Amino acid sequence: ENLMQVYQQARLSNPELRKSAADRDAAFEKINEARSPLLPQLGLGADYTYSNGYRDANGINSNATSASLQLTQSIFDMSKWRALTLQEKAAGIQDVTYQTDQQTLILNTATAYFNVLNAIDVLSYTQAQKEAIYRQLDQTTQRFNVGLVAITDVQNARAQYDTVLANELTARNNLDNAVEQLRQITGNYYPELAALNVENFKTDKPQPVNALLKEAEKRNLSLLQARLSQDLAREQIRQAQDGHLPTLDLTASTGISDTSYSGSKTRGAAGTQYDDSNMGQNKVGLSFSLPIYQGGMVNSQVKQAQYNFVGASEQLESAHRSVVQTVRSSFNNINASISSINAYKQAVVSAQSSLDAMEAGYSVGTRTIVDVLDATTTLYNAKQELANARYNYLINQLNIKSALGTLNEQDLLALNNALSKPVSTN
Amino acid sequence: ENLMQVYQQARLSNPELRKSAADRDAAFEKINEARSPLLPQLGLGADYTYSNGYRDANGINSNATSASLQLTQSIFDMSKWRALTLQEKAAGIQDVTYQTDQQTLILNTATAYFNVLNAIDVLSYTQAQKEAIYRQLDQTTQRFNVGLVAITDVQNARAQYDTVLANELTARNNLDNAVEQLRQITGNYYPELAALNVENFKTDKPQPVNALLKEAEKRNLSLLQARLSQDLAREQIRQAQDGHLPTLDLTASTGISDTSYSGSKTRGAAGTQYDDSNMGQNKVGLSFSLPIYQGGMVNSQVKQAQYNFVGASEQLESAHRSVVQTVRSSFNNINASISSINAYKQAVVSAQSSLDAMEAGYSVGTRTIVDVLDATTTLYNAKQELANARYNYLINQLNIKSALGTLNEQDLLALNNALSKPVSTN
Amino acid sequence: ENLMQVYQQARLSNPELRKSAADRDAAFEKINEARSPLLPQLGLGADYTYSNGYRDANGINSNATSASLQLTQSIFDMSKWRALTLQEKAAGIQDVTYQTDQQTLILNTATAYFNVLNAIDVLSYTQAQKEAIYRQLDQTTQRFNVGLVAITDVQNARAQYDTVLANELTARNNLDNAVEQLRQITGNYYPELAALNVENFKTDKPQPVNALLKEAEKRNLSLLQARLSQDLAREQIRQAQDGHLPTLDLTASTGISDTSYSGSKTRGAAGTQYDDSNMGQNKVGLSFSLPIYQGGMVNSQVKQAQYNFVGASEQLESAHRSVVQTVRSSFNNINASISSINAYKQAVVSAQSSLDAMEAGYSVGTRTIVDVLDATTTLYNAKQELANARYNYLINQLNIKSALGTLNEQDLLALNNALSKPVSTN
């Protein structure tokens, strides 16, 4: 129910987070097959085959029968080690992006949480507006009944009333909308959520921008991923270099053989050579090769890896400019939130005193209760529009921390301190 | 001209629909080559080759003249069947997404069709606004001429007139833009389109939400595609399992070769063995093999397929909760459309009576005709903003029908029933 | 500083432009390896291997020792030439898109610049608004001090003041934002930028739209790229046709051999055949093959390439509809800009005369100076909202020129003519 608990149940409800985790699992597991080729290749084959050599040596008839194990083991080829390193760095990549997605979950969660509150706010306010305009219409109606005014005004207040009805329904509708938005990252409905403890609000001042810039230089996930991409490009480079490598290898195998000769040609002077055999063999030995020159195969690849490299570096710098922009913008947004909160506070005070004034106006009955509710309307609107400003302060409070690439459950707990009273959702 | 006919010509004018159709054609045709490998592989590779030995067995010249056909046919390998099933499911995928795109074309079609209707409205009424403000400029002008109100007001009205002119030009401009928007899907410019039969609106109540839930769950295209994706992942799993398959084979080949001999070394005791060859051959037989352990080849792939599976499943549930969200939101939007239509109707009646009232004001001339056209302004603005609301009702109709995964020409035919009088576009 | 210089320093600062450049370098360089296969394949693969017979073959140990260079050279396979042509066309593609981004850098570069100007504008004027409202607060305050009015008004003016303060901070904030936006393209902060020379502002009429269309047919980069895609699809088609090609080839290689015998079975009646032999060889000759029939390999591929072709064609027409839409829309936007500029000009004149009027009002003291500054507020707001309109005129100019697929530094120079006075940024 509390934002913390909301994070808790939602910690498993997210598929994409779990999806990404599983993807990381795919990467780390893929490292295994990345290690695989270096290991020896035990194998087996078998065959049977009749043959008939027509023409010249025509009339011979020869079935053939054989089977063999074939162990093989390459030794010298660093390219596989290279690919292994690629797999490693890619794994680190997947790790980082996974953490990123975690932070994303945090953000979305908090956002969706606040939206419900805001919807409740607008709901109630639009309601009070409804009643106010309603008795406005009733008054005006009665005023026509005694004939003081033109019918046109009656229809006017009519239109006001219908309009505000639409305003009710759309808002109430937005309520459940946001509710389902919450279920989207939960899979569960919630009857109620804790109200903000506005009385104990934190008007915390921002840290100086430069240190934040430093921490940003140190620990944004994205730029880190860029650097990993760069190093990976370097790995691609040496992998392109790998083509020049001599390929030391070692075969090892044994094989049975049968083959029973037949046909009239075998008859007469078989000379043992035409006789059926039972031979078997245990071949084992080195294998090796070297490309020397291959039409410029391993040449263009080099430059390709190079362009890939420098381009990746460009992406890195782009990320750099990006994080600078983002963090500054966030900081600034926080300040904006501050000032806005100030303004709306004062507005609250204003509408309040105005309200009390008009209430006194009804105290000796100078006005109508309707008007009192008009001031009441302005009052509430100002109220949780100010609350809205506070939540915006919170969101910015996360974004800057998000900008750092840091974030944790603990910040959300600090948020959880802010919550207070239970509040029914619908 | 009518929305139905517009859809009719639209059915061929769309490239992307036809594109997707042809893509389905590709997906189906590819199933054929998916069936292909099982078929026998006939072949030929005759060639000639000189040879000149040296060192130890130096000086014995020769030249082979090989020529042989090679039919081949493996029998046991389920992995290919697996890939066939994959291709099948892929074809189902392409099918589903194709139908989806059809619905998409429908939606966009009706949308663009309505936008024109709206722009016409805004155009006309804006024009009336132009005339009204104009004659205000004239009145105020003359009022300066007789020496009354200060020049500043004159320039004010001037600004009004110029501003509203700009509004005209941008209005007309948007009109032709929308016309082109229509041509974009149609490839045709249309001088005129049918007006809505506003007199006979359909105030249908929405069905209870749960039934719609059950239906859409039963037949949404997207989630269906997800399920196909999951099944495909399972197929990938058995395909990973396929690496344990022994590979039964059957070679079948034949042909002749003539290696003529030459060189001085052949001279002396040729022993028939050094005579020129003239042999042919008819080899045929099985070629079995089983991989045994191979460094963990067919291992990591298993878990990879597994993670692929579960992640796909997570996507499935994701899309599930998603469509729940969407359909509820749609229902809600429809209700909003209802209430809005109500409100604007009443606003229409109101502004109308206000109009008639002021007209009566001019009946003894208390006002100016411009004022009457101000009431007229608010009037028609209200009118076809209400029309706009009705179109929104239509769009929501198609949307709720869309989330079902249903949709067809028929609802659009009912929309065609909604249409009435011809109206020139520009 | 001037827009031209800004473009100049920026012209190298862009990563993505340089990125695309290097990518073009890749596309070109890859043509080399595309040419590569036709070249001769020199090679080598020496190796050594022990052998030990058993069962009938038992007791005759040996160890083969082989070494051989291996040149190879294919003669006839058009598919390689085909793929070469593919690579060529791909190079053309990367070229074109590179040109696209070359325009893209320009557009944004103007955009942010004008945004900076605008931000400066709104900033200053908001400041003036601040001072005005401030003195209203002071007036109302003092008025309460002598007690002419209710406290509620005091709080009202209070609220106005805090609000406008918030507007200041967000304004300044937006200023620095835009500054950083500029740095994003440049990597450099800028103290100052040239003011527009509004006095000599251009108002050229657009060329008639049809001529612009014929011009459009010439060289939009996008559509050209589409046509290249089509031709590429055709190349894919002939490449599918290339599976019918007989594969004429030429083997050419030489190698030595040693192979030493061992074992007691070799002893006795060796018959020369059971003796060590240091043979060498110089094999050379033709190679050839032809598929005949392969289970429908090169069949489904044909239809596949065909579908690829037609789909590409559909994309081409899609691009056609696209460019028509965009160019007309641009033209229209220009017209809108014109009329808007007209309107705001007149508004400026109006507010000006109103200002002078009220100034005269203070000349004999009929009003507060604050009010005069209110007119001042409306004044400047109108002023550089009009400026904003002029920049929109410029942006539209660049847009329509962009739709042409044209654009150059020279148009930006023509823009550079428009600039005038130096202006500090913050």
Swiss-Prot record, chains A, B, C:
Pfam families: OEP (PF02321). It is found in: Cell outer membrane. Residues 250-265 have a biased composition (Polar residues). Residues 248-276 are annotated as: Disordered. This is Outer membrane protein TolC. Homotrimer. Part of tripartite efflux systems, which are composed of an inner membrane transporter, a periplasmic membrane fusion protein, and an outer membrane component, TolC. The complexes form a large protein conduit and can translocate molecules across both the inner and outer membranes. TolC interacts with the membrane fusion proteins AcrA, EmrA and MacA. Disruption phenotype: Cannot grow on efflux substrates novobiocin or fusidic acid. GO terms for biological process: bile acid and bile salt transport; enterobactin transport; monoatomic ion transmembrane transport; response to antibiotic; response to toxic substance; response to xenobiotic stimulus; xenobiotic detoxification by transmembrane export across the cell outer membrane; xenobiotic detoxification by transmembrane export across the plasma membrane. Residues 53-60, 258-278 are extracellular. GO terms for molecular function: bile acid transmembrane transporter activity; efflux transmembrane transporter activity; enterobactin transmembrane transporter activity; identical protein binding; monoatomic ion channel activity; porin activity. Sequence repeats lie at residues 1-208, 209-424. Forms a continuous, solvent-accessible conduit: a 'channel-tunnel' over 140 Angstroms long that spans both the outer membrane and periplasmic space. The periplasmic or proximal end of the tunnel is sealed by sets of coiled helices. It comes from Escherichia coli (strain K12). In vitro, inhibited by hexaamminecobalt(3+). InterPro entries: Bacterial_OMF, OMP_efflux, T1SS_OMP_TolC. Residues 1-40, 75-246, 290-426 are periplasmic.
